[PDB]
Structures are given as C-alpha cells and as structure tokens.
C-alpha cells in the first residue's frame, strides 16, 4: 500500500460540494482519483485547483487528443507513473484510435505523429524534467507550428501536470486497477 | 534576452480586469512578474491560477516563514532558478530574521531550523525532483511533526511550485533585477 498514512482520503459521499470539480476529473477518467478526494479536505485548495483544471477541457487552440498526449509525455518525463497512468487511461477512453495512444511515448519516431505534435510533445518532455532542459531549438519548433494562443495552452497543460505530479507524489497515490492495466499495456 | 519569442507579455494597462490577479501576486513580491503578464493573454488561465496562488497566503496551519521556505526549497530542488529567486525575494520582504532565510538551503545542518522544519523541507526537496525520491522516512518525519491539515497545505505549496517551475521554464521568464540581487546574496 501507500507510504503515506498521515493524510487519508475522505469518502465521496462526504464531500458533495465538490461535485463540479469531481465531474471534470471523473468524466474523462471514469473514476475519482484519491488525490482529489484527499484534496477535498481543504476547500480553498480543492475549488481553486478544480477551477484551474477545467481550463484543460476549455482550451480551444490544440486538439483534444494532443492535450492528453502532452499530459502523458509531461508526466512521463517527470517520472510520475501515477499521473502517467491516469493521462494514458484518459487518452484510451477518449481516442478513437487506440494504436496512436500506445505509440505516444515514441512520438519522435512513430508514424502516428506529425511534426506539429512532435514539436509540442518534445517541448512538454523537456519542460517537465528537473531541471528543465528546454533549449532554443524547442522554442523555435514550437513557434513554427503553433500560435501564441496554442503555446499558452500547451504550457498551461505542462504546468498543471507539474501540480499533479508533485501532489500525487506527496500523497503517494497508488495506481488504481483500471489505469494499472492501461499502463501495463503501453509498456 | 529570452529564448521565448512566440508568446510575449502584455502591458499591465491592457488587462485592467486582471487587477485582482496582479495585486495578490505583487503584494508578496513587491513587483509584477513577467510570468503573470504573459499568462494574462489567457484571462481564464490567469484568474484560475491566481485563485490557486492565493491559497498560499490563506493557509492557516503553517507559519508564513515556513511557507516561503518550502517554496524556496521546492523550486531549488527542481532547478528553477527563476522561482528560487522570486520566493527568496518574498522571504526577505516578509521574514523578521534575514539570517534564517539565507541558511534555508542548508536547513539539514544549519541551527536556525529545528527537526520539525527540516522534516518539512526535506519532504519538499524530495517531492520536487523529477522523479521524486520521496521515501518512507520523509512521510514518518512529516507525520511525527505535522497534522493532516498541515501536511495538505505543505504538499499544496510544493504542487503550486510544480506549476510555477514549469510555467516560468516554458516562458523562459528572465530573472528580474531585485530577485537577481537576492539570489546572488543567498548564493
Ligand atoms: Br506567474 C509568477 C511568476 N513568478 C511568480 Br512568484 C509567479 Br506567482
């Protein structure tokens, strides 16, 4: 089980006020993560982050499939297997082509991804390591295939993953059964 | 100059609607960062994150000096020198004892920090690297000195640094002169 025994998640029926925050999460994921049930014990934190996370769904300048591919690559580059499994599970539940999702982590060589998607996923990878190894060539390629509005939404997803990677590491959230199967298949 | 030329920050007078977002930011810092001026080009994103950042000031279960100490250690462990300089500048404006702030990054051996503060800063450090090297002893030391409520607010600050480290790396925000002087003094 988890190394974290100090902060335990509440029961879902205990925090109905956070249902608008929960739906955005679980509609895409199919279940409510323990990280969000735990976050619910601080209503200021839960509501503020829930309002931030809805920006992912609201983003207009990049395709939906690219949003979760960016999230998969960002969580993987940070070594966050919990978030990597969650965003891969989201990608499989929302994408029509399961093969492109399973080839996400080889985007630099897999024929399912064009130069625009590779530019965004390479930026997300180099953005999410510690320290970030973002070089000038990453910025040039991102500017060559994406608008200023698209770039802001790309970086926002990367930064939101930064919150989720570190939050779920702090909770030592154990990978649920459904994302565990998805992550095993993709590896 | 900056490596990021695709997404440029706007003038402050251009987005007066975001003044509630700016004041909360610059009140702690003394000036308005380039990261938020750039984030202002997505007003939904800027406001959503501003509400997230206000939880740091709003936290009630840990002292103000430890909040910025956690942020300094977290940003440093992640190799985000921009965020490391900014949170150090906040500590100089808010802390009564400047000497304790300057010894923050040596908290494991400096006598300005007790075993409780070292447990929290060691957790923040191991939480913020990619991947996180959080072991069971971090959780035991955190649970021995902190309540569930305090742990949630600590992990929240670390996760908020996760957003900020990657956002300012994605923007390649250049270190301002006032944090640059603070960072040279502390190093
Ligand atoms: Br946006 C942003 C940039 N720097 C800092 Br401290 C924040 Br909050």
Question: Could you characterize what this model shows?
Answer:
Two copies of one chain form a homodimer. Chain A is mostly helical and 187 residues long. Chain A has one domain (1-187). The first copy, chain A, has helices at residues 19-29, 34-39, 43-58, 64-77, 81-94, 98-102, 115-128, 136-145, 148-171, 177-186. In chain A, helix 4 (64-77) packs across helix 9 (148-171) and helix 7 (115-128) runs antiparallel to helix 8 (136-145). Chains A and B meet through helix 3, helix 7, helix 8 and helix 9 of A and helix 3, helix 7, helix 8 and helix 9 of B. Residues 25, 29, 33, 35-36, 39, 53, 86, 164, 168 of chain B line the site of 2,3,4-tribromo-1H-pyrrole. Chains A, B: This is Carboxymuconolactone decarboxylase. It is classed as biosynthetic protein.
Order of helices and strands of chain A: HHHHHHHHHH
Q: Sheet bearing the most strands of chain A, described?
A: none
The shape of chain A is globular
In angstroms, what separates the terminal alpha carbons of chain A? 22 Å
Q: Which ions and ligands are bound to the chains?
A: 2,3,4-tribromo-1H-pyrrole
Radius of gyration of chain A, in Å, reads 16 Å
Percent of residues in beta strands of chain A: under 5%
* Helix/sheet category of chain A: mainly alpha
Helix content of chain A: 55-70%
Q: What's the total helix number of chain A? A: 10
As an assembly, this protein is: homodimer
**Number of extended strands of chain A:** 0
Count the domains of chain A.
1
- Largest chain-chain contact? A-B, 61 and 60 residues
PDB class: biosynthetic protein
Keywords: Debrominase, biosynthetic protein
Assembly: dimeric
Entry title: Crystal Structure of the Debrominase Bmp8 C82A in Complex with 2,3,4-tribromopyrrole
